[PDB]
Paper text:
Human polynucleotide phosphorylase (hPNPase), a trimeric exoribonuclease, is crucial for maintaining mitochondrial RNA metabolism, including the regulated degradation of RNA. In all forms of life, PNPase catalyzes the phosphorolytic degradation of RNA, utilizing inorganic phosphate as a nucleophile to cleave the RNA phosphodiester bonds and release small RNA fragments with a 5′-diphosphate and a 3′-hydroxyl group. Three identical subunits assemble into a barrel-shaped trimer with a channel forming a central pore in hPNPase. Each subunit contains two RNase PH-like domains (PH1 and PH2) alongside the K homology (KH) and S1 domains.
In contrast, our cryo-EM reconstruction of hPNPaseapo shows that the pore is occluded by loops extending from the PH1 (residues 104–124) and PH2 (residues 405–423) domains, which are oriented toward the center of the pore and restrict the available space. Steric constraints limit this rearrangement; only one active site can be stabilized by a neighboring protomer’s PH1 domain loop to prevent steric clashes.
Numbering used by the authors:
A (entry chain B), B (entry chain A): 46 to 669
C (entry chain C): 46 to 668
The structure:
């Protein structure tokens, strides 16, 4: 039992009492909130040639707060914010696993108790760090996680629920030993860059205090790590031979600036087929997968050597050069708002829909105290269809990535959404083509569609993703020199070291999500990434402003119409029908929804004026 | 961009703007309704031994200007209107793929915008044809699709929603080049055969104009088809050796009229086990699947040659003979209505249940999944349990075929269902045994169970399936000769060319679904099939009328009751409970349904008099 | 075709009319309720290397066939009441399949008609027996099943729905020929042990009459059984050889009382891996599964020989001794009630949550009917996370076992739950570690957490699982001798003959579920198990009473409260908002629920007193 003091807060870490069967287990308590995290890793290598790691964060201690009816129904009971928390924990611990650790691993977080004051999400990240540190699962170094808020100008570590309601910043920092950064997740209320950077500095300092506390617990316990029967990394002598066979062929492909996404991939795969052939007879005893990963190591190394040595990219861009950006608005007449944003070979179509404020809400499956009500009556739905990458996939449900990307784009656009808007705003972003940051293009395209729909947003929001290529020595593991890339392609994200997605208006920052694939990066690189992204964001906003610079003076004339109709007490029963039958039928046949305002007035909402006059005669016949 | 004038309608076809990574893509716009269809096909052969083709038509709510109304504010699950549209598109495009194209293929439809006037389902069929035509996927000639309705005695091409509500016919025709027919899907208000037949030729004439426009677009934008890695068809020399090995044994099996479904299958499989083992010895280097497919081709060729050369079928019937038909009603006392319909070895049990009117409108927002309404308060649920074929399979969820068969049998019976029936009519049809058209037996047994239940349907409805065996010219590809079969078995559907399911009253046609396996058939074959099924339908109605010829004068004594109760204002609070809690508790432990029709009076629906007795007991004791 | 008379009740069994394509089909009718059951078994050996058997009891309507629900199955799925019936049917027919019958098999139930009087669940068990009896599937003698209830002191066979509502016992007995018991599943209102044992005697007598009727129907029909392509049982030559290489090593492992669950399994695996290589060399033609299965048979027989010959379990205790029991309550300040029950290496954490009574109903007429309404506003939720056994598994949703264990533990605690409690009571049992009866530990821990939470239960409830090791000669199958084990581990459950779970207070029995793996056991063995478990249950209640002996004087001061607020007619519209937006906005902000009770009265339920302060701020702000 170790206590770590974080300012006025206290973090208690325990182990050895609950779930002694699991490979690692820990209980993290802050105030009267306790989170229990376990880690399990199979000793038999998985058939798949990657690291299968699943993180699941649940609130099963309340039985989901209700009684879901069926097994299939239970596949939806998992809350949205529980999926988002699992994604944050996953990105905090994934980079620290050893390379070639192809073993099925599961990290489970169980909310023992919640006091409604201390947020359990930050405790879950620390619990995952302690559980892996105390387990025999090889995992490099503990990580500490804190949430930084800005309340009336002060910087608060791990703010309570009440403090978060008055904070202009919601930043979560995961830090590795010697002040490295492994995860960043922020949601700011259009705050200045300097204020944002200072909060990262304060947060990283606090995570180091957690790391030394966890390190004290590890020494007291006496953790011993397992020896995996095989770490699946290509032997250096086969990688070296692959380098000889494909160095020049791969270099020519990557220095050819005429390639597009498909042409470059076909060119690389054409080399892969030729090299993987001769590699087989030279090394007959090599594993079939080992040959594939040997080529992927060489192709990645050649790709990184070009940008490091020559300060040029595979499509001829310089380090700070954007892709071609084109925008359109109002492409379909019947949509309330529409925009088509293209960034290189990434294409996103954004739609805006309006609805009643009281629409939704009456859903009965409120497993928590969670219903259709959002903070500003604003939500963003993100969809990534399989044809965006010329792929085949089922369209049943939203996977974790689509739900995570939608929340990120929603965070980016949230601070500029107005209050007291008469309608519920829903923005739908559909990725038609994907070669880059469709997540950030949903913020730019969503911004354009919001102005095109006539929503009076305070400012336009643009996002961009910053990549990173580093040179790291094998004797120390320190970063010697590095390059930051503006508006990375898909191959630069795949062969890079991070996907630093950051969005905001022309004067401030609204959202950030850093997905670092390295085992930590210095704070210096993070500060420069925010600055480099600031210049790119201004350039994107200038292109967007040419297409549309301000919201339209009014909504489209073919949009929703809201007004009241009177029904006296005498004719109330016939109008609503037996048990509200007539109103329910009207909502079924036509989209018109009728709600009771006062004892004698009903508010009629019609999604289109065409659907309005259709239901106008329906209430006329009822009124007889 | 190509424009097609379909009478007073307009069709706009475009490509090359949206979703450029997909193998094929197209946008089809009529009026203000736009649909985007993409087609993706893998270049690597599928592990399965067939063509996996999936069509997923999505009715996204953003296109219609509505926000999903559950607590997640996002659409969950698949609606039954989307499944039916996916089946029509699948029926229109599947026959045109080359034989042996064992590659994973997905066609996706995205509703860009809908104006509430032009129906997007027909546009999605044309969009799938354009996307496949412009892609590199090997696909035969373009397909044009139109909807024909009869409004005030006039034929209208692609009627709007307003005209579709007043039409007596809803026919969808998909045509191939040279006026062939690849898909027919109609529901009619018991219209005459002549009027139905004229609409098919009017529709086919319009689909040729669409094909003309699509071919112009294909010419303008160059299309080069891919060369598949290989086409999985059995070698002609291997097939000819199988014929010399099993033609005589297979001929004896199919001329043995004492067989039933199971014994004939055992006899055929007995020949297959002897022949395939000899085939492996003769062709050791042949593909294991090539052996299986070569026998299937030889068995199909022998089976069809008997019908063509001798006009006699495998069970001894001639081309127009029905199977044995047996009907029975009043199976169980507690059922509101029931019927057991036997057609050869196909056995169907149909049940009628009278539900409350309120349960008909499940469209209310309470559903976390999707739900809607039915025009008349009539619906049919069709079950195909695994034991109907003596096999083991999943029984819970998501069987598109069950949904398609239920919708077909439902629209067959819909025209005769009375209006203003005081209850919701739910018909459940379970296939206890299947050796043929259980979907049409569901229509026959559904009408028997409806008359037995006491529903005053206007006329009895019977359905039948018409098969087809053709002798196609090997080179030219036209039909040299053909035979039409009445009331086909399962084997004649599987080894045939079409499953022409058509139902109707003795004086008209109510439903039609033609499942053509050929790459198009002439209109003269369709016309003869409709006439041949007219003769069979009268014969079936003659047998069914012997069991029961008119609806029973009243519903069964154990049927549902509706009557109102009176509660005073003082006892209203105790009766209803806090937030209507005591009401929801009463209808959950009794099965009744209580609705408030006035301040003082409540209406009570009970499925049985015993259920009403218990509810009456609770009402009086709560009132005192 | 055959009629079986059970007292004042009648059972009509028929076949040969419906679903003639299935391998076996039967219709069982009692009164005006008819159930059709089919049985299909593939002739191709499945690659699963075990017996794939799935039973799907599907009903067409809820509320005793009064609210249709079958059309919703594509979107909603299968209700839990259908899963529980499918498990009862599965337990009755699974042990009678021959060993090595590795063929995919499905039993499907179709409620052709229900009258709202006779329960179709009992008919489905009989129908599954008749369908398998008339089929060509190799399956042992017919199984009869009845339900026994106690109404005003008398014993009633197959009681109607009205009778079951006034019964103090709900016992389902599935009997094999020669008065063997195959399945036992009961829930009682804390009835005496003597009354419980007599009902089992009455039930087995009735199941023998049903078996006579089925045997008559089989003879008339003329059933001939298929010959399966192969029966996957290890050859005696290789089973004997495995006994030669691994008997002494396995004997030492099972006589080492210093082992725990993990270490004992590792030691057996060490012998197994060493034995597999020797077996493969000695029998190169042997199938890979045959090598594996021979070791499992030899290890199982060595394990049982120690209990039979030496009367000592693998962890050193005698046949009656319990494992170490440790209880702990009130571990987290914010939980309404909590308890951590430890029994050997099994650890369960139980939590009590008070919710509003309004949360009981789903407010959708059909969906509320599907899952029903818990009678005392009490439910138990059982979770078996994958880390409880140091494995990785799917997390969302509950498997069949989790639903069954939750229903069993809720039945055990139901009789002591008080009536007219102001709040809905939800108990969550989470298995942190598993080495034995976590389902019965959920009953003990749930009782501790309920007294800790301040719920005035009538008495504490404890459960236990009784094992069985028998020695039967292969010729006849009768039981020469047997040992009954108290509080079995996982290895003794796995290598044993039954998992006899029974729970109750110190003066009665509230729940029972017997999972017999033999093809029936004598009734005298069952009666000894009940008595032996009553002594063990006494020892557990003595330990639990030391931790907490009576419910706390009142609920925790941070628990939920319910109070009323008066809003006038003039302020009603503003308070609720147009379309009830304000009430649901307050619910989404603070978690409180406001329900209108009269014209002026609104009842507010708040999870915490602080949450009610936030709600009260809104109420006065509007007014």
């Amino acid at each position: 039992a170790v206590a770590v003091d974080l300012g006025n807060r206290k973090l208690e870490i325990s182990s050895g009492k609950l779930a002694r069967f699991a490979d690692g287990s820990a209980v993290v308590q802050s105030g009267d909130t306790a989170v229990m995290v376990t880690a399990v890793s199979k000793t038999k290598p998985s058939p798949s040639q990657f690291m299968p790691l699943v993180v699941d964060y649940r609130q099963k201690a309340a039985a989901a707060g209700r009684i879901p009816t069926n097994y299939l129904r239970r596949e939806i009971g998992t809350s949205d914010k529980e999926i988002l928390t699992s994604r944050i924990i996953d990105r905090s611990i994934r980079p620290l696993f050893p390379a070639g650790y192809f073993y099925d691993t599961q990290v489970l977080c169980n909310l023992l108790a919640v006091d409604g004051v201390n947020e359990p999400d930050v405790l879950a990240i620390n619990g995952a760090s302690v559980a892996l540190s105390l387990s025999d699962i090889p995992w490099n170094g503990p990580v500490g996680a804190v949430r930084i808020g800005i309340i009336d100008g002060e910087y608060v570590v791990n703010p309570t629920r009440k403090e978060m309601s008055s904070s202009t910043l919601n930043l979560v920092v995961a830090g590795a030993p010697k002040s490295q950064i492994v995860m960043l997740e922020a949601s700011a209320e259009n705050i200045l860059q300097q204020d944002f950077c200072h909060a990262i500095k304060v947060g990283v300092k606090y995570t180091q205090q957690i790391i030394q506390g966890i390190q004290q617990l590890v020494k007291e316990t006496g953790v011993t790590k397992r020896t995996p029967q095989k770490l699946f990394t290509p032997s250096p002598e086969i990688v070296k031979y692959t380098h000889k066979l494909a160095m020049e062929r791969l270099y020519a492909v990557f220095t050819d600036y005429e390639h597009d996404k498909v042409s470059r991939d076909e060119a690389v795969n054409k080399i892969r087929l030729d090299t993987e052939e001769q590699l087989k007879e030279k090394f007959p005893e090599a594993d079939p997968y080992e040959i594939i990963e040997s080529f992927n190591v060489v192709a990645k190394e050649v790709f990184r050597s070009i940008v490091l040595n020559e300060y040029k990219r595979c499509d001829g861009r310089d380090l700070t050069s954007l892709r071609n950006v084109s925008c359109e608005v109002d492409m379909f007449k019947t949509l309330h708002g529409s925009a088509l944003f293209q960034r290189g070979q990434t294409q996103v179509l954004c739609t805006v829909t309006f609805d009643s404020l009281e629409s939704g809400i009456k859903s009965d499956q409120v497993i928590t105290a969670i219903n259709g009500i959002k903070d500003k009556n604003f939500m963003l739905h993100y969809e990534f269809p399989p044809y965006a990458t010329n792929e085949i996939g089922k369209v049943t449900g939203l996977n974790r990535r689509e739900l995570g990307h939608g929340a990120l784009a929603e965070k980016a656009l949230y601070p500029v959404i107005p209050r007291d808007f008469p309608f519920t705003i829903r923005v739908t972003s559909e990725v038609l083509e994907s070669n880059g940051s469709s997540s950030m293009a949903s913020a730019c395209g969503g911004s354009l569609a919001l102005m095109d729909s006539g929503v009076p947003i305070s400012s336009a929001v643009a996002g961009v993703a910053i990549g990173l290529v580093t040179k790291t020595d094998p004797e120390k593991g320190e970063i010697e020199d590095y390059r930051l890339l503006t508006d990375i392609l898909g191959i630069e994200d795949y062969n890079g070291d991070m996907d630093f997605k950051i969005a905001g208006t022309n004067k401030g920052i609204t959202a950030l999500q850093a997905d670092i694939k390295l085992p930590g990066i210095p704070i210096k690189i993070v500060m420069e990434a925010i600055q480099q992204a600031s210049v790119a964001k201004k350039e994107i906003l200038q292109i967007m402003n040419k297409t549309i610079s301000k919201p339209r003076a009014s909504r489209k004339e073919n949009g929703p119409v809201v007004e009241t109709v009177q029904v006296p007490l005498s004719k109330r029963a016939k109008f609503v029908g037996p048990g509200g039958y007539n109103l329910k039928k009207l909502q079924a046949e036509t989209g018109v929804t009728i709600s009771q305002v006062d004892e004698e007035t009903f508010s009629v909402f019609a999604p289109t004026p065409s659907a309005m006059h259709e239901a106008r005669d329906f209430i006329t016949e009822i009124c007889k």
